[PDB]
Amino acid sequence: WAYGPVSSSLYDLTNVDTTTDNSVLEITVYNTNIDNRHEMLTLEPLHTLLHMKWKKFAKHMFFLSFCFYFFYNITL
Amino acid sequence: VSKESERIWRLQRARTILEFEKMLPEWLRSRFRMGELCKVAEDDFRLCLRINEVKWTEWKTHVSFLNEDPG
Amino acid sequence: RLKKRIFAAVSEGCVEELVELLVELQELCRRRVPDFLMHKLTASDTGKTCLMKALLNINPNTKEIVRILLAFAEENDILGRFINAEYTEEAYEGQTALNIAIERRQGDIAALLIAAGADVNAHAKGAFFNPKYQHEGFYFGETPLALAACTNQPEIVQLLMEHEQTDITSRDSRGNNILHALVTVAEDFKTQNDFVKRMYDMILLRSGNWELETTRNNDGLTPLQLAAKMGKAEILKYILSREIKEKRLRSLSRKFTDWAYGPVSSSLYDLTNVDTTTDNSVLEITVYNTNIDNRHEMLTLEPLHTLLHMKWKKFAKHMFFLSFCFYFFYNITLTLVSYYRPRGWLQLLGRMFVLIWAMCISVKEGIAIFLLSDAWFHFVFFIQAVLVILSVFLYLFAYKEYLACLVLAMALGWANMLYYTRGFQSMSMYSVMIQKVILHDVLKFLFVYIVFLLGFGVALASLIEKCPNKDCSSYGSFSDAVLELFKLTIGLGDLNIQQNSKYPILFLFLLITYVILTFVLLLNMLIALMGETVENVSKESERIWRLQRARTILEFEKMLPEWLRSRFRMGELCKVAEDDFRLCLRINEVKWTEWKTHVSFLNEDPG
Numbered sequence A: 001w002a003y004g005p006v007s008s009s010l011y012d013l014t015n016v017d018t019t020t021d022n023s024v025l026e027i028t029v030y031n032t033n034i035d036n037r038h039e040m041l042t043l044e045p046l047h048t049l050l051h052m053k054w055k056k057f058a059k060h061m062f063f064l065s066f067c068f069y070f071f072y073n074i075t076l
Numbered sequence B: 001v002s003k004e005s006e007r008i009w010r011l012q013r014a015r016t017i018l019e020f021e022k023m024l025p026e027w028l029r030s031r032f033r034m035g036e037l038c039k040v041a042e043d044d045f046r047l048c049l050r051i052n053e054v055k056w057t058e059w060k061t062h063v064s065f066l067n068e069d070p071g
Numbered sequence C: 001r002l003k004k005r006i007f008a009a010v011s012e013g014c015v016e017e018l019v020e021l022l023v024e025l026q027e028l029c030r031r032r033v034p035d036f037l038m039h040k041l042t043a044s045d046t047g048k049t050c051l052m053k054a055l056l057n058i059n060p061n062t063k064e065i066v067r068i069l070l071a072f073a074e075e076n077d078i079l080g081r082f083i084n085a086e087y088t089e090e091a092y093e094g095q096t097a098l099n100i101a102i103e104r105r106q107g108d109i110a111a112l113l114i115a116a117g118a119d120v121n122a123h124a125k126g127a128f129f130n131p132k133y134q135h136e137g138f139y140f141g142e143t144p145l146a147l148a149a150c151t152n153q154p155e156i157v158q159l160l161m162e163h164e165q166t167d168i169t170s171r172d173s174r175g176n177n178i179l180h181a182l183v184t185v186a187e188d189f190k191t192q193n194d195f196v197k198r199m200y201d202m203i204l205l206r207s208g209n210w211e212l213e214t215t216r217n218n219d220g221l222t223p224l225q226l227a228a229k230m231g232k233a234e235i236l237k238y239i240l241s242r243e244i245k246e247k248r249l250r251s252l253s254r255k256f257t258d259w260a261y262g263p264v265s266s267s268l269y270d271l272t273n274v275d276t277t278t279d280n281s282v283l284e285i286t287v288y289n290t291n292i293d294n295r296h297e298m299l300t301l302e303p304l305h306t307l308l309h310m311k312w313k314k315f316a317k318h319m320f321f322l323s324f325c326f327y328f329f330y331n332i333t334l335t336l337v338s339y340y341r342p343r344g345w346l347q348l349l350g351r352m353f354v355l356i357w358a359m360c361i362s363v364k365e366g367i368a369i370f371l372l373s374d375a376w377f378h379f380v381f382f383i384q385a386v387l388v389i390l391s392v393f394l395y396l397f398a399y400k401e402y403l404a405c406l407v408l409a410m411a412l413g414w415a416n417m418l419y420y421t422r423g424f425q426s427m428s429m430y431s432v433m434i435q436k437v438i439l440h441d442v443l444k445f446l447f448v449y450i451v452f453l454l455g456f457g458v459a460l461a462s463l464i465e466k467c468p469n470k471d472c473s474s475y476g477s478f479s480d481a482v483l484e485l486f487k488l489t490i491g492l493g494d495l496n497i498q499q500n501s502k503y504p505i506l507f508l509f510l511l512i513t514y515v516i517l518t519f520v521l522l523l524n525m526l527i528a529l530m531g532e533t534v535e536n537v538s539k540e541s542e543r544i545w546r547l548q549r550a551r552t553i554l555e556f557e558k559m560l561p562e563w564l565r566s567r568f569r570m571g572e573l574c575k576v577a578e579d580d581f582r583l584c585l586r587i588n589e590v591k592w593t594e595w596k597t598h599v600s601f602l603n604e605d606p607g
């Protein structure tokens, strides 16, 4: 899409978007025996895919879970 | 502290997102389905994820693009 | 059929022979008149013609494809409606082949186009080129000159300006001219290498007059005022101190070295539209625009910094110290009135003085609120003044609940002395890092500690057993337990294992847990304020000091009448042109590094 200093790179999500048995994203997040993920989760499609999943549904579900747990705690 | 806090928070957020990811049913997950469609090859139509950007440093006569008309 | 055929042939450009054959076939079909050739040579969806389609896909064959296309359009003599043709879709409304050739950096083809009569001032006022939300669109000035200037193409900029049909004074759908666009797209040196300043200088001194800098856009701002409205520090630092040393263009400068003798020199800056004597100055914009977040650098520029300094040392220091003294005496009077409350010497004098001072300052702060850790002091000053006035009105009234308001007002005014202890370097740093502690960190620490208190209080008061001598255990009702936990945090409570518990071991465990965890929160607070802020405290203190000084100076400047302001009138007069005599602000300087045979000055003899 590039016009000038602006441009729209169109990345790929063939085997990256967790819609496969063993995707690259679920591997990169669920592999805790590598100890480098603080850098790997800043890569090109991984970072913004996490961001998009988050702002689409994970923020909502996480805040709902926080509210339910806070009410369970205050009622305890 | 500043760096370790952010790296452990980022790991936690990734885990929670991917967690929730599984907590949802198949139909709702397909209803979310991050990414779009895109034609690149003769017939590829694989999934894609647009990312706009701005760079003033490297000027190049653009030669490769899918849609010649920028939308 | 043949339309898309020629379109793909020219877009691929894999050969010119077949495109020439297609052109010959189209000409034969058109012979057996120009409107038909246009309709067949364009796509009526948007208007994208074969020339545009060729330029969009740069392959090494374009240099001849465009020549063949112009030759064909001249064969029917349709060049006018051919090259000057433009889009029609709501995205690129008006976009012309010239902006396409420039966006792809094809300079030679741009030359061939303008030689073919390409409309150079064709405005690309499309909803894409003028996007409201960024990152979807590229606003550049909507003009081929504006485009070749914003995308760092000086060759084509000179090629357009040296032409006669160009119009450097053109104005777009936003009112901007070329200079407004160059201001709008100038970001920062770390991301651009600052070519936009170079193109600014070139385009400015090329059209040599104040035509460009004097026009205002549909927002009523000039390119100088514009770069002031946004946070463009680099372009601003250039425009404010711009020296043109050529003779015939020397009148365009805003800084004239007029006095240099040796390593000493007296640059004579300009104060035409900078000195707050206009509707919206560059200085009042630079200080009152709080939505840019770069002023910590912009208020160190060439005439701005020293103009603030001069206004300060001329009248603002005096007025500010007077205000501090008046507020301190009003505060000591509140203190003495509080101390000597009734358990006209002490009543009438002091009470009427605090009444009038509080009412006037409350009206002042309230009307100050009506303008739109920077400026909440208006809120708190107004609140304290209303507190005093309500307290004294209730004292006059039939309500003995006035002492609460009065003593709270005293404690709040003594708190508000924090505003006025911004003045000197020691008190500035002290007050502002106290503010940073208070607002940044200890407040969230207090929140989490209050959650600790609530939880541990309910736990302990749930562990207690009623005494048959109910006062035999201090952790009685909830509020009692919370008080004891407070005292334990500060170090005044008592640790007695016999709290009439039913599980004394578990109660002792919970209590030790509370004190340990609040100890840990104290340590965490200590690290948060001893490792993080300590780096940038020195810089944040200075920038907040500077911004508050700018605001106070510019505020006092308004508080004065017209005659006294004209009596102050920072700056002097100075003759620089045939008849210019614009205001100026001398700044002596000393530089031993760059030795130059002085060539330009106003006074031959240094005074």
Ligand SMILES: COc1ncnc(OC)c1C(=O)Nc1nc(C(F)(F)F)c(-c2ccnc(C(C)(C)C#N)c2)s1
Pocket (backbone or CB within 6 Å): C410, C411, C412, C414, C415, C416, C417, C418, C438, C439
């Ligand atoms: C130099 O200050 C003084 N000099 C001499 N005597 C004084 O007291 C008589 C004082 C004094 O501190 N007065 C105060 N009043 C109040 C209030 F209750 F209105 F909020 C204060 C307060 C309360 C809670 N959080 C803050 C934060 C952390 C935001 C701050 N800052 C401030 S502080």
